[PDB]
Amino acid sequence: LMRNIMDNIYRTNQGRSVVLDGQVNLEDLLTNEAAGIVRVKSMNSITPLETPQLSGEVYGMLDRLEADRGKRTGITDRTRGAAMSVNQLMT
Amino acid sequence: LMRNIMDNIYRTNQGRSVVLDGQVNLEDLLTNEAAGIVRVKSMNSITPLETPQLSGEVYGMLDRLEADRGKRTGITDRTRGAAMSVNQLMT
Amino acid sequence: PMDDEQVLRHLDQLVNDALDFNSSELSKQRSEALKYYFGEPFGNERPGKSGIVSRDVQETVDWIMPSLMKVFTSGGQVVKYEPDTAEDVEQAEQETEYVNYLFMRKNEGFKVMFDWFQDTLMMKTGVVKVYVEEVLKPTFIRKDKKKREIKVLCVKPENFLVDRLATCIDDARFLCHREKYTVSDLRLLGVPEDVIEEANREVWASECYTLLDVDGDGISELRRILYVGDYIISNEPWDCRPFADLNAYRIAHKFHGMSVYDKIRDIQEIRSVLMRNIMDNIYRTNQGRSVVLDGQVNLEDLLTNEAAGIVRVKSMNSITPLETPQLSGEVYGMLDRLEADRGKRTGITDRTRGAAMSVNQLMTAAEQQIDLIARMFAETGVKRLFQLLHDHAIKYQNQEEVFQLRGKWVAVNPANWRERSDLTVTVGIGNMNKDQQMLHLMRIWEMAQAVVGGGGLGVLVSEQNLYNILKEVTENAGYKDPDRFWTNPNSPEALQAKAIREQKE
Amino acid sequence: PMDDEQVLRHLDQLVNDALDFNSSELSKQRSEALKYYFGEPFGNERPGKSGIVSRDVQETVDWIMPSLMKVFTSGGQVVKYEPDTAEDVEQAEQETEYVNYLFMRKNEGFKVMFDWFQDTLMMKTGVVKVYVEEVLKPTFIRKDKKKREIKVLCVKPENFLVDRLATCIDDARFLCHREKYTVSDLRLLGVPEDVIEEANREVWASECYTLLDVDGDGISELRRILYVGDYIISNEPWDCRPFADLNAYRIAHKFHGMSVYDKIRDIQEIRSVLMRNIMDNIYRTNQGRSNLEDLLTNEAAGIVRPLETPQLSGEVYGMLDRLEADRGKRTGITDRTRGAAMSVNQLMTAAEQQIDLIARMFAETGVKRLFQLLHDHAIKYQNQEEVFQLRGKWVAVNPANWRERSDLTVTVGIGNMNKDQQMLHLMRIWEMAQAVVGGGGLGVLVSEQNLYNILKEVTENAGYKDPDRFWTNPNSPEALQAKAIREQKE
Amino acid sequence: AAEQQIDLIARMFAETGVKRLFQLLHDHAIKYQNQEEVFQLRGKWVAVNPANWRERSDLTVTVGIGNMNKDQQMLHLMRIWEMAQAVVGGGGLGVLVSEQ
Amino acid sequence: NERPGKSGIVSRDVQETVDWIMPSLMKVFTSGGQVVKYEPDTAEDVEQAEQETEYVNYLFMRKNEGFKVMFDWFQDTLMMKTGVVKVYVEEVLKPTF
Amino acid sequence: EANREVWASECYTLLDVDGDGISELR
Questions:
Q1: CB-CB neighbors (< 8 A) of F12 in chain C
Q2: Which of B80, C146, C496, D79 is deepest in the core (most CB within 10 A)?
Q3: How far is the C-alpha of D240 from the C-alpha of D245, rounded, in Å?
Q4: Distance of CA E51 to CAs C311, D97, E25, E30, F57, Å?
Q5: CB of C243 closer than 8 Å to CB of C128
Q6: CB-CB contact of D453 with D471 (8 Å)
Q7: Taking a C-beta distance cutoff of 8 angstroms, is the pair C393, C414 a contact?
Q8: Which residues pair with D162 in a beta bridge?
Q9: Which stretch of DSSP H or E encloses residue D67?
Q10: Which chain E residues are Cβ-neighbours of D338 within 8 angstroms?
Q11: Chain D: nearest CA to C176, how far in angstroms?
Q12: Which of B15, B46, B80 has the CB atom closest to C366's CB atom?
């Protein structure tokens, strides 16, 4: 999931610009270099399609993944899991 | 992530303006110089596309990267990670 | 063997190679350090935009000064021989005063020491040279002729060419110290003729301390050469190099160490780039990118930098001004930790010093570095405080202590501590002021008053040791001798104040 | 060797070379700094349009002096000594109050301080000279003869010729300081003749501090020469040069320092051009592009008898705002009025204000100034006594220098300003004292004899230590009657 | 008031009035009368020989300082008031800005 | 991987971990000579045990370049990944003759 | 040059050069 998150960050940075054959021989320089302008030859249509963004709630599962470590053995996700929590909060 | 964030700020400063051939010989001066005027010749179409913005929640992951150092060794990301917290909160 | 002229060429080759390597590497690194200190743009700033560089090493060094100044520019009682019992009192503090009286308070104050710390902290190399000079102006009562005085000067470590494979002070096979030594000094030496380079022809000269063998035998001791321009030299065997080649940072095994630059460059970089990003974001939020076609508003909108009031195109009414989404204030909060970055690197002054009000000064100001840094910087001076010490110990003067008593004599030839003790402020016992204040006073004297209520004062500490109990309080406050004596170990007033009036009250 | 006349031509050549280089480049840089400070046109203003210039560094100066005024001109604790622990109240604090009572409040007050900071901060070279003069007008009770007093004056750093290869105060091989030294001074000296140049002939003179050899030997102590016009000169051995050559930014290895304009070139230039462009846009929008050339479309025309001029938006105001943020990131980080426990330590000194470190460097540079002053006052000054909280002071011509100063409690060192160290120390030590007093009693912890000092840091932070509230009671005949007689037998 | 350029116009207005004031200042700096000012309190010497000062200002109106009433009101009052009450609670009065 | 024409700025994260683990380690180790004891047989303890402990913590500590050897030992094992030190002997000189 | 910047090494290894079992360190 973290690898896919950073991959999504990358693909949002580039954007899928599909060029035709006969123009842009050098594969758009992978759409992200110190060029900025694409240039084809005489075509003016161009097909840059943007991959749709994602939602931040993905990171929410991140939290419960720690709870996954919480649910198996590591319930002390926090610093520690009357009479102020007797028996160190029932062990 | 920080390099990509400043690169995103950069590409928002310029914006991807793709010009045709025969007009704008000097590549818009990379779209940000102390010249400003575009000038083509007589055509008026022009194709400036603006890369969509991203979210500041990226910095949020930045925070948990400290918590990453928090999760590995530096659990005292803050100043410090009845009986008034004996043993300085159990070591 | 039988080398008298080939030594000149060999020293010339060593000086040239040291010039090349040392100049290039150390000079470029120290120049980067000084440029970061000054705060001008790094050179990667594109034209038309501010090149702001927020100074961070400046307040770093100004934050690490106070403790070091308190522990060096305060007396000379920091180090005690505790030597052999028979010859202890008449030599130990005699030499303590002798060295803290020559180097401090007779070698241009601490200004040489302060510039030397500055060189070892920013300019990446701190080292000073100790030499001797002859006094003039007799009465011709007050016949002061041929008097010899020991002086110390900053070597301009940019002119301190040396082999990089030494890693320690007493390991350099070739020590080069370059200075002006104007044509007046040339005439003082006796040469009427000069080098390629007005009496002050800004002639340049160098001094070489190196171990060699010119007598057709094994490698001899250190030799001093006045290699100016490969001309008449002042060749002389040398006893011990008067240097300490500080690094201030006990870096991995090399002669020269890192500096404030090599540890604060990342912090300064991130702070400067996020200032630049914040101002660029303010620019794009307060500007508004108006996407307008040509043929209407042909004059570039003046990069949208002029005030007219309304956009307007020509005859159409589309107008496409896009408003960039704003930011979040957490960056400023994120900005906060950059101060904590200094707080995590050098900035003790997030608080003045450092539940029980944040025990142990908030666990050393949230695990502050500089204590260790102070400690190591202390060791950075230790060998220096030894070397110059011996350079003093031979023969300087016959001055006395004024230190808490009047009347003392010359210290001629005792030892040199064969060490230095710097544990009272830092990673040693080193409990700094308010923490030890609180802990010691509160604990020990609540115990004492509890016993006094229960048992009494006679069984425990008496006034003779309430002396020390209150003297730790005073030394935390900073007034040991003058305002409150309280000594009372065994005094004539003790009998009439404790053994007569208190016992027979 | 045996030089009496070649020194004259050597100093003449040195003064001429320093004149050329120093005078030239200092003069142009300080002149452009002054022009930018006063809002004078840069010279690029085309004729026919207004040359209004918006000033920026003026606000920087107006926000940079008051902080120094609070952190320095508040009490006599500006510079501490902490010498050998032998006798601090008898000589160390004695000499400290001597210098801060004479140099300040007796030598043109603090006006010379402001002039020195102006020299180092705007006109790019801050340095002053310390000299001596003879007091006169006795009663011939009030017999004041042979008395001399030490003065300090700004050197007019426009007349402070010096070689650029110094990189330090005590490293220059040639120092030239040019003053008027009018005909009255010439008559006092005793010269009968004048120079190429009404009694006042506006004569000009110079003073040279150098290292040379007129006795046929090596470099002796400094030499002071009254080189005016290659005439009778006053040659005298001297111990150390009386100068401080402030740079105000801890500049690299060169004698002359920088100024505010030296870091506000670009920001002031862009602010000026942006304001000029804004007002020109307002003007052109008022006219708009439309036989007698239409009288600029806004004059006594009435009816023209025309493409729409392209229009813009005033949102450029944000630019203007970040100009202050420019100051916020150049020098005035307190873009606002001021940059747990509600922002402790004044929000960590307004987020590490660099004014504090500027004060630190100013103090450490003025350590040399106080060094020169204490030498000039301890060589032989007078039998003058102090009013430092108590009467009684011996002759101040043979104390010891102790030759080391400090600025511990004023700046970026421990050096927390008045309020922060005040409240912290007071709440901590007090609350613990009263807690144990409720536990044990008043005499259990630190006692009234040292509650003296505990209130004394409060007083020194307030400025009235001894006279208004003595509260000493350390060990006195009244102490025995009050602490050891009535308190013990109560 | 939304970048109202009447500010800059006021500026020139002000400086024009500046000259006006100087002129009338001269007309009062030569000889007007022995009258005194009621400026919140008694006391004003004869206004027939004031100094011209050869300078005026219009900073608090326009493109100069020119920050009007209520903006300074909220900003300054809020910030200095919170700072002063925090200092009074924690530090005190005399050490920083005091009753004086 | 920093392509030309664009900044390749690198933010170091290991350094804060290093400087957070170092000070607590120094506090727990470099604090008096009470860190290490011997507690030998009950009768033969006061004779040499604390005596040898003070001898070692007064020679190695406080006489053999302080804690710098062991501090650099910790630094080498913590960052450069190999912390190990070597012990040798040498002969004393400089008599009075 | 007398100081020929020579490099040296030291080896601790257990072996048997006495015609017997492997001895202690060398």
A1: 266
A2: D79
A3: 14
A4: 51, 41, 9, 10, 82
A5: yes
A6: no
A7: yes
A8: D175
A9: helix D57-72
A10: 79-80, 83
A11: 21
A12: B80
